[PDB]
């Protein structure tokens, strides 16, 4: 039953007490990242199903809230996360824009427009 | 012939292990400590 | 090449093995046994034939 | 993330994982020494039959286990690193294999300064003549800045010579040894 | 006596200064051994007890070692000494003629292995330069093989069917048949057979090396036994064993040939292996791996250029297929390594037509190349024959018709063949040529077989000079023909 | 950087590094090897940790060896200097001819053609296939299918397309042969070097070669692919030329992926493939398409394990393509070839709009009778053919007389079966099944129809019958 | 040496050493059981522990128990003197008449003879059935598949095969009744009383019986036949003649085979039979063989499942 | 207990399938290795051990008996599932109950082709 955040690197920063310097309730550091999925530590305070905002602007939904750590899939491809990275809440549920502003638009399944015709002027949100 | 020689072979060679087996207990520990010691020594002059 | 206890030790014991071969030593009554009984398929895979007798068939005509 | 510096000798499983998040932690500040001391200290301290068996019950809050060790750790003044460690295997559950862990530092701290271990296998004892020359010979085996850390052992299932153990190198002058092999190439 | 004293003295007793390793637990055929830092991946280990493994996994805290025999000859605690070299077997000319098991020590008798050369199991197969088109034919002696469905030297075939339907028997004769050109003056043309026995009752084994050895067949087969009880790393093992004692052949300008029996039943070994590894079981419970297992080890058998030696490796590997299924997991994995196929029905070979091959089926995709241009000649006709006649015969009018349906059996009758009565090409020019113009259609269906022999025992016994035309000029010239016709028509008038 | 090798299993390397680990797709060189082995990275487990996917044999990898990290992903030589060579997965040449001289390098992990970039137009292609043409008609500029158990014509049908598209075209050409036979892949080099395609002393060369064939470890077949598919783009972008891509067998793609997917400590998939086999192959197929900047003509063959065409290889990758074409094992059990199911090939230009309406009406008249034939199968195989009204007895022979004359003698297997190779045009294949669909030749045998070109020739072989 | 049972999950005990392990194939004797608990040793965990497989009911084994390592694989009498006797895989004698006397011990964990000893000239074992020897003749060292179920003369055809052997060539059978119901080997076991195979009085029986019962756990199924295998083995090894060797049932073999490995935990293979289902079937059909001293014939009741022969 | 004091006894298990199912989930939440239809290894052991106590002492033991009527469902008549076959072979015969017959007027709906009775006639009187 070896945790997951039982690694020597955070094992490490809790034995010679440095983790007060750094903010692990709106905010954590990729333990490990593969296959499109990524493992956060941290983040003490995300909700569930709740997104959260990469230090590369990928997008992620933390899905699995593990007692130590966050597993977060991330919106895109993983090649630009790396060990250590700085995942930082959004602090809302997932949600896409709407309005009828989309109307005639081929947008993504973020809420992104993919028509290269320019940005969505929605208004409202939805979960 | 082959069978007998075979036989006899192996009839022979157990007897052998029984004397070897015996003759163990025979006093040459020192000279033996001393010739492995040297032994030792060579294989650590090629280790290096 | 004698420094080698061993080596010395199972020459030595050998030959004794050999003077006191004088004589087979140590058969051991299995050691009879075994050898009826593998004399004895061998024989039979072979025949009843004499040890050195040499034979003729005694030919004949259709 | 940090980086952690890499203890001499890998261990693996919790027990080395801890012990390598230890040895980075000291590394740092260049505490070794002294926090071995504490960790060897801890080893008579929890041995301790009261601690020993509230520490395995496991129907004491672990919040307790965790109060009872930041008393027992203050009262001997341990290091921060010290105590820092204990409260964390307190708090993930792991002071159950505590003495796995802080022998597993004295493993990685030995390998820090050169302690390189052998061991020795004869079918009797050896005369302190014989054994000191041995132990002059084996020296000539290591590099400089290394010491050897002979162990002695006696075995009677090996007949004559030994078998030395010098880390990883392994030599068998054992007589059973030498006496399979003549057995096997001249049967073969 | 004292020959056992010297054969006592030149035994290696120099002890050396060498890695070692404990095991830690050994079970389900892999032990874990602690330690070993500087072991290669694919290394071979030694056990304390005289066994061998392979180094399979290099964990961080431990090595995953395969052991290549049986997993109670290891405790917990042993001691494990890397010998250095990935796994080696020992190859040359020294080994023809011996039984050696799957790692190259001779389950014979008959002395050690006096090899002084080793290849690895685990090399890789030459590229795409290397490699020239088949060329050359290899005979198996075989009417309906070498005329239907021929072979070439560097091709695989492939053969294929159900329990008891023939296929060591047409291993077998193909290797009897070589000795012919192991005999004659050009080494050009002396095959040296190989044959790994997978998965096989002990008891067969013997009985075919006895049989090779009643056909003076030994001089040059090598026979990698890894039997039915021997571990399954062993039968895992034992292929490229072989195909390594094959590549040396290859590898210096020679010519081999190398026949796996089975290629199922190492599979199955292989499935053994991964399921005790914990692997994820796929189709059938079979390693997604169990592919790559068969194309790494059959796209050995090339053929090198001229500028490479010149050598080659045919492969003859042999599938068995539960109640024919041609489309199973493994039979199609292997029709998709091969360059052809000879599917042995089970119902051809219970009517009595023997050896069973499916010429509907059947197929080399190198065919027509690399075949003696009589044989061509001749059978060509046969092939379009048989073909008619298969396209008719689903029910027994006209005369055309009635003329297919008699053709074509009477050429089935003719491909019937004997145990360990391989023929020389000429001899299968010839029985194919009486065949296929025209010189039997009187003579009933069921005497075609004793023709044949008759036949055969007059063209050897008198004509002798008109098959070694044949056989030297690799053709039938038009008075070869005329000689032929007569000769056939002659021969049959006396009946 | 430097790392150093702390677990090899397979083909699967765990290697630790000190400083900075490498981003995941990146390439790292194992210092100290007798040869060139790449590791491409492809998780990272934490610890400063990766694992890596060898690109070679990883055997005689001692734990703790040093890895240097190359700091990009593999890089191939791309440019007109590839043309008439032949390229493993990391881009070294195995011809032996010297080295790739190019100017410009890619790397073989780029990203899909975005939505805004995609091109639209349709366009028959004709192929000379009597079957192709008629039932599933090629599109020009997009991907194709064949779709094959083993043995049944995957490989002597994509040499036809060869043969056929290639050799009468204008742009260059890849092939790109993954996990496939090494002998065939000499054989297609030097088949192409004898029919000046590839040019040894010139730079008159139309093709490049890449070769991951099936005795390379799984992480080479699994990307050999990509190396296709960058020396593809190439010349489709930064040449804004038309392109032929044929890759042979693209589903030693995913089996790689799969075989190596057990390793990296995922839980298998339905059928032991990977979790990640859609995605996996998504990411793959997205980049091979014709967009604004050029056109790449894609044809690819599809192994169908043990003959199941609901297995979740062949089942997910129908979805990428434009035109399919299922060949069937039990179609070449009757000796027809090519062994072309006509009512499971698809094409998406059937389209009375596209290929006009007497071709439609045509194709869809031969598949409707088929179906009728098929669906009649059941009875006659039991009740025979005297069990059947006299329309449907008909049907049957029209349906049989069908089924023969879409079987084609094709160049390529003149070998087999030494018939002379016919190109059917396709205004002769509608003619053709117009006519035998309206009842002109009723009167004719069935084997009349085996294995003939245009219908004139079904006719004069009628006529050799006949006498 | 002695080692303390662990753990009893069913009928898988796992033992712990503390002075040396006892190598894989090892039988345990459990102290402290009325009857005699064998356990047959089957891995090696690590930390001196060893998970083992029992051949009895592992009911009231408590976790401390003393296990004493008898030092060789499961060893029974082999002598002569089995012939009427009855005996279970551990070799004790299921037929209350007294001990099994014999001066010779077997361990039933063997090899197969190596590959010189292989007889190579394949002989016709004769019977003396017309019907068995014309159309379908048996061979020495051969092993033979008997179809049919009930009520068409199984143990008629075997009794009469035992007799004739045993009259036409002086070599002895074993019957080893793997999975055997009880009512079907008492009756068996009277049937041969009755027909004189066996005989209660002069010594002159022909038949060795061993019954792997059908309650017994796993581990003892699946062993059984090495027990019949191991008696027949001295019969043709140290008495140099040919031998007949019955298995009824052999596919309770397999299927035992296959509940001990999924007891141990083994990923269960194609269709639930274990991974080592070839070799378990190699091992044991390996060592029934011709020799160049005798010959062990084996006559192997079978039974197919689903009416499915692949 | 019956049987041990020269009493007859004649117990009908109904079924014997639903104690297959109930120690399947005992010891798949005691998390032993699944096995065939998730059924652990000893669901043969389990019913062989329990039906192998239907004997017939002898007079030296009393005389008693205890005959054994286990009762099987099977799914869709599939009479080669895991427990079916499983009791299959550990008893003495069988008697199937096919629906079929059950609603042609055949009740009971003993298929009298499948069925048999090992022990045959030996347990049946002379009139019989
Ligand atoms: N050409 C032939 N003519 C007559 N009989 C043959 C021929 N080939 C094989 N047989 C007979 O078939 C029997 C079994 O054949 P063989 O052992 O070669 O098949 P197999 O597929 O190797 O069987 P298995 O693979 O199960 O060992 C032999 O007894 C042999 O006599
Ligand atoms: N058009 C054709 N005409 C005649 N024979 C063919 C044809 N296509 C395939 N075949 C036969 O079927 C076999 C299939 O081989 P091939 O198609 O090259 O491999 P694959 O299994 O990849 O399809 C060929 O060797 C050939 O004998
Ligand atoms: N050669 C024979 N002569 C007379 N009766 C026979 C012969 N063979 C079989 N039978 C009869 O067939 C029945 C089958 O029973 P048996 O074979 O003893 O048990 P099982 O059916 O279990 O093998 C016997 O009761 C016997 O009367
Ligand atoms: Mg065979
Ligand atoms: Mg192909």
């Not at chain 5, 241009?373 to 379009?384: D, I, N, P, S, Y």
Request: proline share 4%; net charge neutral.
């Amino acid at each position: 039953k070896t945790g997951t955040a039982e690694v020597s690197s955070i094992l490490e920063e809790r034995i010679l007490g440095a983790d007060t310097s750094v903010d692990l309730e709106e905010t954590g550091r990729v333990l490990s990242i593969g296959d499109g999925i990524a493992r956060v530590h941290g983040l003490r305070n995300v909700q569930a199903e709740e997104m959260v905002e990469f230090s590369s602007g990928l997008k992620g939904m933390s899905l699995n809230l593990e007692p130590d750590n966050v597993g977060v899939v991330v919106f895109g491809n993983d090649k630009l996360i790396k060990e250590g990275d700085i995942v930082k809440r959004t602090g809302a549920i997932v949600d896409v824009p709407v309005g009828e502003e989309l109307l005639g638009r081929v947008v993504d399944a973020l809420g992104n427009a993919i028509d290269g015709k320019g940005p969505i002027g929605s208004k409202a949100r939805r979960r | 012939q082959n069978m007998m020689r075979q036989k006899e072979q192996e009839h022979m060679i157990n007897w052998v292990e029984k004397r070897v087996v015996q003759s163990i207990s025979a006093q040459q520990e020192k000279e033996t400590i001393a010739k492995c010691i040297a032994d030792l020594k060579l294989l650590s002059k090629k280790a290096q | 090449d004698p420094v080698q206890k061993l080596f010395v030790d199972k020459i030595r014991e050998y030959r004794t093995k050999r003077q006191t071969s004088g004589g087979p030593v140590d058969a051991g009554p299995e050691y009879q046994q075994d050898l009826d009984r593998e004399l004895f398929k061998l024989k039979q895979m072979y025949g009843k034939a004499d040890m050195n007798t040499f034979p003729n068939f005694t030919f004949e005509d259709p | 993330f940090a980086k952690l510096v890499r203890p001499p000798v890998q261990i693996y499983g919790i027990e080395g994982r801890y012990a390598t998040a230890l040895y980075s932690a000291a590394s740092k500040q260049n505490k070794l020494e002294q926090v071995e001391k504490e960790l060897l200290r801890v080893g008579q301290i929890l041995k301790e039959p009261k601690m020993a068996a509230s520490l395995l019950n496991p129907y004491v809050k672990r919040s307790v286990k965790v109060k009872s060790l930041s008393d027992m750790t203050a009262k001997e003044k341990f290091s921060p690193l010290t105590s820092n460690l204990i409260n964390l295997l307190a708090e993930n559950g792991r002071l159950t294999n505590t003495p796995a862990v802080i022998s597993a530092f004295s493993t990685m701290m030995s390998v820090h300064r050169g302690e390189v271990p052998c061991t020795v296998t004869t079918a009797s004892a050896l005369d302190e003549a014989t054994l000191t020359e041995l132990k002059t010979v084996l020296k000539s085996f290591l590099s400089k800045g290394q010491v050897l850390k002979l162990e002695v052992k006696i075995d009677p299932s090996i007949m004559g010579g030994m078998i030395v153990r010098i880390g990883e190198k392994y030599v068998d002058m054992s007589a059973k040894t030498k006496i399979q092999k003549l057995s096997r190439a001249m049967r073969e | 006596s004292s020959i056992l004293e010297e054969r006592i003295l030149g035994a290696d007793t120099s002890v050396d200064l060498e890695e070692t390793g404990r095991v830690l637990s050994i079970g389900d055929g892999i032990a874990r051994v602690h330690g070993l830092r500087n072991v290669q991946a694919e290394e071979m280990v030694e056990f304390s007890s005289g066994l061998k493994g392979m180094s399979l996994n290099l964990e961080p805290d431990n090595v995953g070692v395969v052991v290549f025999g049986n997993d109670k000859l290891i405790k917990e605690g042993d001691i494990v000494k890397r010998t250095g070299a990935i796994v080696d077997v020992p190859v040359g000319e020294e080994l023809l003629g011996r039984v050696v098991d799957a790692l190259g020590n001779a389950i014979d008798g008959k002395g050690p292995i006096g090899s002084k050369a080793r290849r690895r199991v685990g090399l890789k197969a030459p590229g795409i330069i290397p490699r020239i088109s088949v060329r050359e034919p290899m005979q198996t002696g075989i009417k309906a093989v070498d005329s239907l469905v021929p072979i070439g030297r560097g091709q695989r075939e492939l053969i294929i069917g159900d329990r008891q339907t023939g296929k060591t028997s047409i291993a077998i004769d193909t290797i009897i048949n070589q000795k012919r050109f192991n005999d004659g003056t050009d080494e050009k043309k002396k095959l040296y057979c190989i044959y790994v026995a997978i998965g096989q009752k002990r008891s067969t084994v013997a009985q075919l090396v006895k049989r090779l050895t009643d056909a003076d067949a030994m001089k040059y087969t090598i026979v990698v036994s890894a039997t039915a009880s021997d571990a399954a790393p062993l039968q895992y093992l034992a292929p490229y064993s072989g195909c390594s004692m094959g590549e040396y052949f290859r590898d210096n300008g020679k010519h081999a040939l190398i026949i796996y029996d089975d290629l199922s039943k190492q599979a199955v070994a292989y499935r053994q292996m991964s399921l005790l590894l914990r692997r994820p079981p796929g189709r059938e419970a079979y390693p997604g791996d169990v592919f790559y297992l068969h194309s790494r080890l059959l796209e050995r058998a090339a053929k090198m250029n001229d500028a490479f030696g010149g050598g080659s490796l045919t492969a003859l590997p042999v599938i068995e297929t539960q109640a024919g299924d041609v489309s199973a997991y493994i039979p199609t994995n292997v029709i998709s390594i091969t360059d052809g196929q000879i599917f042995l029905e089970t119902e051809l070979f219970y009517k009595g037509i023997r050896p069973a091959i499916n010429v509907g089926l059947s197929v080399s995709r190198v065919g027509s190349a690399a075949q003696t241009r009589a044989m061509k000649q001749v059978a060509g006709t046969m092939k379009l024959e048989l073909a008619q006649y298969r396209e008719v015969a689903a029910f027994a009018l006209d005369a055309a018709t009635q003329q297919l349906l008699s053709r074509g059996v009477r050429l089935t009758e003719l491909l019937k063949q004997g145990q360990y009565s391989p023929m020389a090409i000429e001899e299968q020019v010839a029985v194919i040529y009486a065949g296929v113009r025209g010189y039997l259609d009187k003579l009933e269906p069921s005497k075609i077989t004793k023709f044949e022999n008759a036949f055969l025992s007059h063209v050897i016994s008198q004509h002798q000079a008109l098959l070694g035309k044949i056989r030297t000029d690799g053709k039938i010239s038009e008075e070869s023909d005329a000689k032929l016709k007569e000769i056939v028509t002659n021969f049959l008038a006396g009946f | 950087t430097t790392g150093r090798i702390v677990a090899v299993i397979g083909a699967v390397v765990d290697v630790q590094f000190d400083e900075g680990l490498p981003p995941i797709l990146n390439a790292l060189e194992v210092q100290g090897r007798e040869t060139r082995l790449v590791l491409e990275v492809a998780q990272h487990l934490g610890e400063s940790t990766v694992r890596t996917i060898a690109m070679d044999g990883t055997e005689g990898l001692v734990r703790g060896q040093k890895v240097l990290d190359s700091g990009a992903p593999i890089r191939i030589p791309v440019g007109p200097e590839t043309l008439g060579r032949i390229m493993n997965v990391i881009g070294e040449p195995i011809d032996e001819r010297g080295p790739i001289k190019t100017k410009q390098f890619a790397a073989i992990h780029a990203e899909a053609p975005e939505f805004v970039e995609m091109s639209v137009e349709q366009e028959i292609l004709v192929t000379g296939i009597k079957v192709v043409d008629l039932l599933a008609p090629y599109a020009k500029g997009g991907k194709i299918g064949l779709f094959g158990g083993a043995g049944v014509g995957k490989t002597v049908l994509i040499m036809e397309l060869i043969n056929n598209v290639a050799k009468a075209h204008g742009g260059y050409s890849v092939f790109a042969g993954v996990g496939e036979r090494t002998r065939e892949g000499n054989d297609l080099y030097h088949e192409m070097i004898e029919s000046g395609v590839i040019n040894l002393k010139d730079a008159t060369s139309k093709v490049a070669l890449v070769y991951g064939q099936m005795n390379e470890p799984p992480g080479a077949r699994a990307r050999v692919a990509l190396t296709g598919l960058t020396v593809a783009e190439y010349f489709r972008d930064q040449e804004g030329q038309d392109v032929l891509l044929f890759i042979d067998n693209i589903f030693r793609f995913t089996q790689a992926g799969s075989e190596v997917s057990a390793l990296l400590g995922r839980i298998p998939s339905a059928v032991g493939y990977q979790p990640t086999l859609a995605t996996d192959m998504g990411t793959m197929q997205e980049r091979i398409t014709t967009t604004k900047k050029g056109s790449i003509t894609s044809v690819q063959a599809i192994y169908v394990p043990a003959d199941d065409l609901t297995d979740p290889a062949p089942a997910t990758t129908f979805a990428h393509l434009d035109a399919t074409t299922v060949l069937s094992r039990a179609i070449a059990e009757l000796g027809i070839y090519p062994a072309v199911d006509p009512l499971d090939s698809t094409s998406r230009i059937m389209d009375p709009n596209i290929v006009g309406s007497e071709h439609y009406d045509v194709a869809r008249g031969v598949q409707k009778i088929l179906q009728d034939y098929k669906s009649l199968q059941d009875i006659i195989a039991i009740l025979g053919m005297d069990e059947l009204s006299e329309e449907d007895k008909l049907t049957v022979s029209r349906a049989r007389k069908i089924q023969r004359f879409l079987s084609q003698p094709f160049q390529v297997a003149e070998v087999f079966t030494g018939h002379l190779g016919k190109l059917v045009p396709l205004k002769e294949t509608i003619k053709g099944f117009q006519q035998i669909l309206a009842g002109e030749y009723d009167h004719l045998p069935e084997q009349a129809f085996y294995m003939v070109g245009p219908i004139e020739e079904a006719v004069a072989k009628a006529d050799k019958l006949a006498e």
